[PDB]
Amino acid sequence: PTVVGRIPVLDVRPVVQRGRRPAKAVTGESFEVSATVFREGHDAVGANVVLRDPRGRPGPWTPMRELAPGTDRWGATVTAGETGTWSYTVEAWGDPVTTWRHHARIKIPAGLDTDLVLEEGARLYERAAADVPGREDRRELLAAVDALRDESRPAASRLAAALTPQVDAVLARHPLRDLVTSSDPLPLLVERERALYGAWYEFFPRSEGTPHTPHGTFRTAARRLPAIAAMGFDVVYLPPIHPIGTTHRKGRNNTLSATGDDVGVPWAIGSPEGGHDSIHPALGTLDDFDHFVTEAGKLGLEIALDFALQCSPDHPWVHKHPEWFHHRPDGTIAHAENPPKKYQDIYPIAFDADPDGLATETVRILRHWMDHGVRIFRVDNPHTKPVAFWERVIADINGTDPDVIFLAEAFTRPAMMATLAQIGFQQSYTYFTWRNTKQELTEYLTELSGEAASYMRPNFFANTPDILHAYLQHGGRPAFEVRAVLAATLSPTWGIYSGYELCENTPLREGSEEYLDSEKYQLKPRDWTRAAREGTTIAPLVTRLNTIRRENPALRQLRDLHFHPTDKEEVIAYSKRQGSNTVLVVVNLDPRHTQEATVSLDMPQLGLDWHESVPVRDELTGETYHWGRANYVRLEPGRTPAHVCTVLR
Amino acid sequence: PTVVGRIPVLDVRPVVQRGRRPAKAVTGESFEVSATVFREGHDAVGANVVLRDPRGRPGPWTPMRELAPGTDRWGATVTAGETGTWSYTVEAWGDPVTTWRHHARIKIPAGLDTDLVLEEGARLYERAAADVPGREDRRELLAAVDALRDESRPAASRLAAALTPQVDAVLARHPLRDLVTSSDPLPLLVERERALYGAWYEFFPRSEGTPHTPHGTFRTAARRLPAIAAMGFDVVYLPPIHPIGTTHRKGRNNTLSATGDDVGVPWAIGSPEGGHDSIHPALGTLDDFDHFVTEAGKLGLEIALDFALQCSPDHPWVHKHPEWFHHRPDGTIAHAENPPKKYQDIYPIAFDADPDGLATETVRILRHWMDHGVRIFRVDNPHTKPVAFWERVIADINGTDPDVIFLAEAFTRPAMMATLAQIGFQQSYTYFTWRNTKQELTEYLTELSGEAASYMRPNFFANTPDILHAYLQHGGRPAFEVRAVLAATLSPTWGIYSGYELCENTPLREGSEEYLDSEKYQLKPRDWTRAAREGTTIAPLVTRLNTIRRENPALRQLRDLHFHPTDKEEVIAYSKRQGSNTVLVVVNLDPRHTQEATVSLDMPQLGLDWHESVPVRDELTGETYHWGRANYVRLEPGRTPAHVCTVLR
Numbered sequence A, B: 001p002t003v004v005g006r007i008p009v010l011d012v013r014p015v016v017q018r019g020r021r022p023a024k025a026v027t028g029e030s031f032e033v034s035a036t037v038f039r040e041g042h043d044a045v046g047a048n049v050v051l052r053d054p055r056g057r058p059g060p061w062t063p064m065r066e067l068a069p070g071t072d073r074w075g076a077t078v079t080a081g082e083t084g085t086w087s088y089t090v091e092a093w094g095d096p097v098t099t100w101r102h103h104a105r106i107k108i109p110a111g112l113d114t115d116l117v118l119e120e121g122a123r124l125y126e127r128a129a130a131d132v133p134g135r136e137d138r139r140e141l142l143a144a145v146d147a148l149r150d151e152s153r154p155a156a157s158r159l160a161a162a163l164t165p166q167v168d169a170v171l172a173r174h175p176l177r178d179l180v181t182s183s184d185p186l187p188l189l190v191e192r193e194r195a196l197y198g199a200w201y202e203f204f205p206r207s208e209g210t211p212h213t214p215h216g217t218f219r220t221a222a223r224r225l226p227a228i229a230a231m232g233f234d235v236v237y238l239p240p241i242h243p244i245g246t247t248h249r250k251g252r253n254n255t256l257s258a259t260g261d262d263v264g265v266p267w268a269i270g271s272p273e274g275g276h277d278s279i280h281p282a283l284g285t286l287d288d289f290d291h292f293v294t295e296a297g298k299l300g301l302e303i304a305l306d307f308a309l310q311c312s313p314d315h316p317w318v319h320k321h322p323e324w325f326h327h328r329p330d331g332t333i334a335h336a337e338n339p340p341k342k343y344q345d346i347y348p349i350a351f352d353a354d355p356d357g358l359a360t361e362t363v364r365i366l367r368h369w370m371d372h373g374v375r376i377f378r379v380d381n382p383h384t385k386p387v388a389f390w391e392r393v394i395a396d397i398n399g400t401d402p403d404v405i406f407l408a409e410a411f412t413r414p415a416m417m418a419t420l421a422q423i424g425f426q427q428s429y430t431y432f433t434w435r436n437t438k439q440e441l442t443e444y445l446t447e448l449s450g451e452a453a454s455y456m457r458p459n460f461f462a463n464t465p466d467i468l469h470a471y472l473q474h475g476g477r478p479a480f481e482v483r484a485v486l487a488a489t490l491s492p493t494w495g496i497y498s499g500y501e502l503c504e505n506t507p508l509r510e511g512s513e514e515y516l517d518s519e520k521y522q523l524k525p526r527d528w529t530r531a532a533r534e535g536t537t538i539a540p541l542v543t544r545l546n547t548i549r550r551e552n553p554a555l556r557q558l559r560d561l562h563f564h565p566t567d568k569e570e571v572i573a574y575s576k577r578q579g580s581n582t583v584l585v586v587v588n589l590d591p592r593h594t595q596e597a598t599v600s601l602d603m604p605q606l607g608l609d610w611h612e613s614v615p616v617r618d619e620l621t622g623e624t625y626h627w628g629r630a631n632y633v634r635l636e637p638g639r640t641p642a643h644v645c646t647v648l649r
């Protein structure tokens, strides 16, 4: 038996790990299946994609086309339906009608064999008719057969009868396919909408307290939720909610020794009060947390908990499972590191003495929180734990609960970042914060929206508690506005960390990405009410961006994205589409100076002719413009960060 | 079981068809096995390649290195031995000694935990010692252990004792490997030297006749063999040696109707006198052919027969197996085509009515010629027959006779070209004749010597009976000289078609690649003796090029090739290496004007320092030069096509 079939169909994509892991989609998402298809000799081929759902049922007739002439690379778009494990096959075949037509069109005007050629077409059409289930369509092809065979009529006329539009449409729907050959099936995992699409908000409950009790509880912090819903967020990502160690606790601003009142770092998980299955006593009880989760649910908010597989020196695991830590010869456990960053307040887990026990406990913890309505976990620094460990944990949890979503906070090298997505992380943090120029943004999003999109779903946090980028530091409010726009329109998932709205941009010191007086080491109460009344918050912009997203399907996908040239380096332009919805964005990346540019749109890339002029509405302002091949824009920092335009029907 | 192992080893290369077809080498050839290797956390990894022979025996310790820092891509060179099917695996592991050393070097000068750090190194060294089979090497590591543990000695001193050269050499040969993890084996087919390396000469026996009997026989044509051997060729490729049809026979210059004495085209195979298992009666008998083959063998020449799976209208198959042809409704068979080229004199084969009978007969024909000492077949236009058909045929023949070599004359699109090589064709014709500028040559050879080298072995014919390129037409003798130099130094297999030596360059007409009075349609006697005495032949250059090839192992491989920059567009420079043999070639691609240029050698790419000045000998002239980073060359067309230099040792 041969590896290549009768009609070669090779190198089907997407493929992940050579077919050993599935390619990804979410319900209702479209993507391109491609293949290399050709045959021996000079006759034409065709191809189509057969997409199978979890019960094995084939989808609709999905014909492919050659993506560029003479390349033998064929493609077609497919669309994922319900969640679960699907499979896709590419079928290739000889296309004898297209071949016959080609020759007929030359030979009949040339008087060469006109009877023999026409009879050959007659027979092709007969075979095509036999496979057609429609009675009307069958009658139509057979009327062509009779015409082709009518030796009473001129050659040119008999041929024309076989090339009518209504003959084409029947053959387009039901082609004569010779020597049908299939690739081996490739696996596709289809997950829920939120894996790809969602707007995220991170805050620390303990900061949302009162005058009498500064350390916030779940009951007091629930009061922030309506404001977060009103900004159009879907997911609230909480830092670790557990007790916090006292041994080597850090103080304010990442000092080494905490003083009497210091609250410490939430990631230094565990004390005698409990571990990863417990609630910090100062946030309240498990019932309080259920209340917080219920109230979020009513506002259309899901909770994502932080999961940081690591311990403070006072976590019960230290004494109950010493073999989950690596001990030096004197018995001590070296504190974790991400050099030059030191984490004196925590111990990293060692996985090679009792991998099974770690696995079993890890999934039990996750299942505990799942039973309390947390169906999303933001996994802290996964790349310092074994890759195969996450592969096993995720498979175990998604085996019973396939709706659970894992976000990988892996700020590290590409190989590892890719691998973690491929072994099952539904979402990944990305290099976004370090893509600020037009070159950087264009290259990186070309990468994310291209081949990487078959295994990685990006979550664009414009800031995190650990990343306050120089661009926001030096750019002030207008920089916060630009990054919001970019994040929210370039990725169908994005997020901000509370304080972003208020344009908090004071670093620990020049050349650092840490915040001064970081919320990681202290309570950080904020006058939300004052900011709203004094208008020193960008919440209204954020709110508007999420509404636009909710209103335009094109922004709820990733893969369809195109960059349109401008004559200014500071000005970037791009479009995204989904069905008839098209969104066109132009952003001035200069946060200090007004930029005027000419934006030269790739009209065909919008599905318009070059001369055409399409009306647009800038959804940020409600203003309308008539735009075409070449468009003057003028963008003043502080007044306008960007145009975010929809193309009107 | 997880898809990723404890220490990730991913995307092992080379790979062909995702592991479904083997990668290729020949006996004694070197190539790079690579893989993506990394781990969690910040500790170091190592990796090594385990290469297995047909009996399953592992080869030598072959450590890999990271090919560029921070990339996580690792590689090592391996060398194929005896012929047959091999396998390669990549092992990845934690490298705890490299990790410990790194920290020790910082901490000990810092006075930070010196005792604990040194004791940790002691224990690592002890474990490494336990796996070392040599008693002396074991004593050496244990002496380091004792030194590391001597608390009476200064920290800096105890550490130094563990980092001596003689400790490094023991650990380099027998590292401590944690958590060893392997890839799945990948297949490698190792074939004989000639599949990769050989010089080819094509001629038509029928042209080497006499005054009394113009149509040459095998007995008269055997007289050409010594001259061919003298030119340093290894393989004589004959056009089809079978009877030739009379129905629709072509005349001189590809005219449609042959006249009385016209000999017709050898590819129009078959008459009542016999088919593909027969000898044209005018060439003599099978015994005469055995004589020709025997005499070739004694001169160090292997025969390669043309195999064209096609028939003249008078081939016996036409009536004996009509279902091997596609018939139109009136019973006729359309003559073969490769538009705008027409082959009115032949019928193409149809494969779908009796694929089994075609397979059986085809391999019987091949076996017939094999039993008469032909162990090489040049397969005519394989891309007009099914790919899976060649896959089945070749597997069948190589199953019993793995030494037989197939060369694919597939001048067609890349996908088909690649695929035919991948499904088992040992050699491929290439786009060479249409790569004449420095950009063209550089790009194309970068491609052939790169990833394509794991499945395709190129045969650079500078001309064929069907391709006389415009460059030779317009360039005259000096162009023939350049192309000979390029072909013979750029690919370890090359060839010419008789007449090339005499610089035959008259086209059928302006803008054609056909020869005037082509030998395909007529006897073409040549005054070899006169050319030799009048010196109007480039046989001496050809002879010299093959000798240089035979004397320099670098020219007998493909994959090691590097292009060195010059300040002149007409002047190209490149080097090839194999062990200590280095050949450096500089060619003036202008055939009409002298070119002077400065050749700036990538010295490290030669394995020399930038300031170094190495002696070379131009093997064309015997002249010696001292060359370094920058070198003036002056190349006059007719006098010197190129410098073909060896680096002296």
Ligand SMILES: OC[C@H]1O[C@@H]2O[C@H]3[C@H](O)[C@@H](O)[C@@H](O[C@H]4[C@H](O)[C@@H](O)[C@@H](O[C@H]5[C@H](O)[C@@H](O)[C@@H](O[C@H]6[C@H](O)[C@@H](O)[C@@H](O[C@H]7[C@H](O)[C@@H](O)[C@@H](O[C@H]8[C@H](O)[C@@H](O)[C@@H](O[C@H]1[C@H](O)[C@H]2O)O[C@@H]8CO)O[C@@H]7CO)O[C@@H]6CO)O[C@@H]5CO)O[C@@H]4CO)O[C@@H]3CO
Pocket: A069, A070, A071, B411, B412, B413, B414, B431, B434
């Ligand atoms: O009619 C379309 C075509 O017309 C014009 O081309 C003329 C050309 O300008 C002249 O210079 C001449 O071309 C000869 C050429 O210079 C010689 O070098 C030789 O060409 C060989 C190639 O050098 C060699 O590589 C190989 O070529 C293969 C390609 O490498 C490979 O990519 C593939 O080619 C496919 C193309 O990649 C793909 O785009 C598609 O081709 C389209 C062209 O790209 C598109 O621009 C257009 O091309 C024009 C051309 O630009 C004009 O100058 O038409 C195509 C639309 O379908 O498909 C290609 C496959 O068909 O495969 C090829 C080989 O199959 O092989 C060739 C020779 O083996 O020979 C040339 C002629 O003797 O003449 C032509 C017109 O006759």
Ligand SMILES: OC[C@H]1O[C@@H]2O[C@H]3[C@H](O)[C@@H](O)[C@@H](O[C@H]4[C@H](O)[C@@H](O)[C@@H](O[C@H]5[C@H](O)[C@@H](O)[C@@H](O[C@H]6[C@H](O)[C@@H](O)[C@@H](O[C@H]7[C@H](O)[C@@H](O)[C@@H](O[C@H]8[C@H](O)[C@@H](O)[C@@H](O[C@H]1[C@H](O)[C@H]2O)O[C@@H]8CO)O[C@@H]7CO)O[C@@H]6CO)O[C@@H]5CO)O[C@@H]4CO)O[C@@H]3CO
Pocket: A411, A412, A413, A414, A431, A434, B069, B070, B071
């Ligand atoms: O190593 C010596 C090195 O020293 C100097 O680096 C300084 C640099 O110029 C400053 O700009 C700054 O660096 C910060 C950077 O500019 C910030 O934007 C941010 O960078 C983030 C990246 O933007 C983001 O992409 C991600 O980085 C990943 C890369 O994208 C990814 O490709 C890969 O990186 C590997 C490289 O591809 C690989 O080539 C190899 O890198 C070496 C360089 O090639 C080599 O030239 C040299 O560079 C100098 C440099 O010229 C000086 O400026 O060293 C490199 C290490 O050998 O190895 C890379 C693997 O490490 O992976 C990374 C993720 O690791 O994330 C980063 C940050 O999260 O932050 C930067 C931190 O300051 O300061 C540095 C001084 O440290």
Ligand SMILES: OC[C@H]1O[C@H](O[C@H]2[C@H](O)[C@@H](O)[C@@H](O)O[C@@H]2CO)[C@H](O)[C@@H](O)[C@@H]1O
Pocket: A250, A254, A265, A266, A267, A268, A269, A308, A342, A343, A344, A345, A346, A380, A381, A409, A465, A466, A520
């Ligand atoms: O208590 C541990 C540690 O936490 C911090 O850094 C976190 C960070 O918040 C995470 O999101 C990610 O970057 O990994 C780290 C570990 O979970 C503090 O910055 C650090 O100073 C503190 O010691």
Ligand SMILES: OC[C@H]1O[C@H](O[C@H]2[C@H](O)[C@@H](O)[C@@H](O)O[C@@H]2CO)[C@H](O)[C@@H](O)[C@@H]1O
Pocket: B250, B254, B265, B266, B267, B268, B308, B342, B343, B344, B345, B346, B380, B381, B409, B465, B466, B520
């Ligand atoms: O006489 C049949 C046919 O053969 C020729 O072309 C060959 C060519 O020599 C091969 O190198 C390859 O391209 O396939 C062809 C068919 O076997 C003649 O050049 C052609 O005119 C002739 O009709």
